[PDB]
Design a protein around this ligand. Structure first.
Ligand SMILES: Nc1nc2c(ncn2[C@@H]2O[C@H](COP(=O)(O)OP(=O)(O)O)[C@@H](O)[C@H]2O)c(=O)[nH]1
Ligand code: NA
Length: 303
């Protein structure tokens, strides 16, 4: 259905882990696993389709060697995706940003795919490193972000799911939680948020965030705890474009808007299992990303 409309393009070990985790939850998705490391690809649990960059191996967080291996295979990689999954409207790229092949190869491949196939929708799921990681790791994530900004009109051309490894102790938890959040998002159509409404949310440009909250505490309090604990990178703006809401019981939607952010269009529905809010079209969290430059400059001066 909506899930078969989506094809993931995980690039690198971390991005491969996330999509693999998601497929473990639900195999209704499509994915082409891209990596310089044949080892990582062979070690995947649920990869039916993989693409090993020829004559390549793991790049040990060196993004310019990743490009070295990949640059000549960019088009065929895109050929693989678009012609094997020709009936997929939405191509979501998934990559960690501090790595070598995820960080260095995703922005050229994404940017090129945009130009070759203009009428498909493109998403980017990126993962910000922990603050304790070193200069190179942060320099890689800055370079990754900037390459995508420069290739997508500052995030305006694509959907952005921005994740923060600082928000959890284990990277695996980030993997599990996002995989859960995205699939719950996709299952909102089970008064219901319809598929076209889910489609609108999913394909909305700029930065998207998915939130779930409990029905114990007050809803303003309950959403506040979700925002604070969100695996997504923090946003400082107070508006968004489209908002999806699917809850177990009747809720004050305006309270949700005051806490999560004010949308110009809302889709509301009900489900029997989760209380989920999706904010889409949030301005790309450049402020949160800018902090990496602060880490770089503070770690640099330590030397
Ligand atoms: N959330 C999450 N982050 C990861 C994972 N693996 C790696 N990372 C992050 O990405 C960086 C290493 O990227 P990795 O994907 O292993 O390198 P790549 O294969 O060259 O893209 C580390 O600094 C981590 O911050 C993962 O499985 N989950
Ligand atoms: Na499912």
């Amino acid at each position: 259905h909506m899930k078969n409309k989506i094809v993931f393009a995980p690039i690198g070990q971390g991005g491969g882990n996330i999509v693999d985790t998601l497929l473990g939850i639900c195999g209704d998705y499509n994915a082409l696993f891209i990596n310089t490391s044949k080892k990582d690809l062979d070690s995947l649990k649920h990869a039916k389709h993989t693409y090993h960059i020829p004559y390549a191996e793991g790049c040990g967080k060196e993004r310019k060697k990743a490009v070295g291996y990949a640059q000549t295979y960019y088009k065929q990689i895109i050929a693989q995706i678009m012609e094997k999954f020709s009936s997929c409207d939405i191509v979501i790229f998934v990559a960690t940003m501090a790595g070598g092949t995820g960080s260095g190869i995703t922005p050229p491949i994404l940017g090129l795919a945009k130009q070759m196939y203009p009428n498909k929708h493109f998403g980017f799921v990126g993962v910000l490193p922990k603050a304790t990681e070193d200069i190179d790791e942060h320099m890689n994530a800055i370079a990754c972000w900037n390459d995508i900004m420069r290739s997508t009109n500052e995030g305006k051309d694509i959907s952005i799911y921005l994740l923060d490894n600082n928000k959890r102790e284990k990277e695996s938890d980030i993997n599990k939680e996002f995989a859960t959040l995205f699939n719950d998002f996709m299952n909102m159509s089970e008064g219901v948020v319809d598929e076209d409404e889910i489609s609108k949310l999913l394909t909305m440009k700029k930065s998207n965030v998915i939130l779930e909250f409990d029905d114990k505490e007050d809803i303003q309090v309950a959403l506040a705890k979700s925002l604070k604990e969100s695996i997504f990178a923090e946003y400082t703006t107070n508006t968004c474009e489209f908002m999806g809401i699917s809850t177990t019981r009747v809720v004050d939607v305006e309270a949700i808007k005051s806490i999560v952010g004010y949308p110009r269009r809302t889709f509301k529905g009900y489900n029997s299992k989760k209380n989920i809010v999706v904010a889409t079209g949030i301005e790309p969290q450049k402020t949160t990303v800018q902090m990496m430059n602060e880490i770089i400059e503070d770690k640099m001066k330590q030397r």
